[PDB]
Amino acid sequence: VAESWCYTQIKVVKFSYMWTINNFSFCREKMGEVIKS
Amino acid sequence: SGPVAESWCYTQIKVVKFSYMWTINNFSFCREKMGEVIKSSTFSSGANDKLKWCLRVNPKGLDEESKDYLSLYLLLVSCPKSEVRAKFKFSILNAKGEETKAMESQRAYRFVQGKDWGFKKFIRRDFLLDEANGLLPDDKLTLFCEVSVVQDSVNISGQNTMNMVKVPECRLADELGGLWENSRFTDCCLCVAGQEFQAHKAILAARSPVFSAMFEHEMEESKKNRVEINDVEPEVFKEMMCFIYTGKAPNLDKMADDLLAAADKYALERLKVMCEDALCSNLSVENAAEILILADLHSADQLKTQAVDFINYHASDVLETSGWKSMVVSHPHLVAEAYRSLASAQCPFLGPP
After folding, report:
1. Which one of A15, A25, A30 would you mutate to disrupt binding with B, by most B Cβ within 10 Å of its Cβ?
2. What is the CB-side half-sphere exposure of residue B76 using CA atoms within 13 A?
3. How far apart are CA B66 and CA B55, in angstroms?
4. SS3 state of residue B66
5. Phi, psi at residue B237, to the nearest 5°?
6. What stretch or stretches form a coiled coil here (chain A)?
7. Inter-chain contact B6–A15, Cβ cutoff 8 Å?
8. Where is B155: in which H helix or E strand?
9. Which of B101, B136, B262, B333 is least enclosed, having the fewest CB within 10 Å?
10. How far apart are CA B264 and CA B291, in angstroms?
11. CATH architecture of the domain covering B18-149
12. Does A20 touch chain B (CB under 8 A)?
């Protein structure tokens, strides 16, 4: 049995990102309040 | 997963790290009382010279605080006005070149013009003057210092698009190098030590001036097939030919000496540099004189420089070697350059002994 379908697919957007710091042990320097990316 | 992150960022707060060594004669004979100033050379990192550092040590610590202690201060000579923030540490190096007393600054100490940080109460005077430790050979204190200057913020961003297609890597080096092994469509011979190889004028003249010169001087018109080569053996000439076509030298380390000679013969700049680099890694005490001879014969400036440095460093063990005396009797000019070099770097005008 079937009379009316309404899929109304919820819009999903997805995407990636990465963050590499090569000197994490010594990446502080400025006392590490915040790193402006 | 490693999905490339779509957008990607590679921020890099680079840190330049270098070292500075100081050794003072008769340290127990200094006796700087109550902040008397003794200074050291203004030294930079080495990669250019924009800012300079200099140490300042008081064998008897200044002020009533370090009355029974050694006060040691690191001073900024000059720098750009940016509130410089660089980390530093100090340690005492023993006679055997082993780090002994690690005292690291807890953070990147801030420096400006005319300002000097330091590890006050560096070392207690009773322990410092104690000769039983062995840290004072000939009453000389060797200090090892490291610095970690930072430029404070440089960032990179993006992109790595999808690239739905998959482009293979360029194959000209791989494909063209396959010309040698097949020896396809060759039209000239190449005699080496009674053994005949096959090549052609185009690539050889392309990647070496010498072959270009000897072929074009009426030789390729009449005697193009036959060329007389006897200064080298077929085994090394195989690799050097492979370098001419392909531009690579896989079997280089096994015969790095006569292959350097072959490169010098035909003026192969890249292969000369590669042979110098490969052979400089195998420098040793016994072959120092021999390596000096080969470098001098082929005008290997870089390898000659490193060999000069090596003999200056290890003359204590090289003179007794037979190679050194053979070089002396045969080619005394290298003895003259060795005398000039060693009389300036390590054993010069009595300082250091």
Report:
1. A30
2. 24
3. 18
4. coil
5. -65, -30
6. none
7. yes
8. none
9. B333
10. 15
11. Sandwich (2.60)
12. yes
From the number of C-beta atoms within 10 Å of its C-beta (0-12, 13-18, 19+), residue B340 rates as: exposed
Length of chain B: 353
Query: How crowded is the C-beta side of B46, counted as CA atoms within 13 Å?
Result: 8
Alpha helices in chain B (DSSP H): 125-129, 172-182, 201-206, 209-216, 219-222, 234-246, 256-266, 269-280, 288-297, 301-313, 315-318, 322-330, 332-342
Gaps after residue numbers in chain A (C–N over 2.5 angstroms): none
Peptide bond into B352 cis (omega under 30): yes
Q: Do A18 and B11 touch (CB under 8 A)?
A: no
Instruction: Encode burial over B3-20: b for 16+ CB neighbours within 10 A, e otherwise.
Output: eeeeebeebebebeeeeb
Which approach determined this entry?
A: cryo-EM
DSSP assigned state of B168: P
| DSSP classification of residue B176 | H
- Using CA atoms in the order B339, B344, B350, B353, what is the torsion angle rounded to 10 degrees? -90
Token output for B21: 């060594």
Interface residue B16 vs chain A (CB under 8 A): no
Distance CA(B309)–CA(B32), nearest Å, equals 37
Question: CA torsion, points B51, B52, B57, B62, in degrees to nearest 10?
Answer: -40
B171-278 sits in which CATH class?
Answer: alpha beta
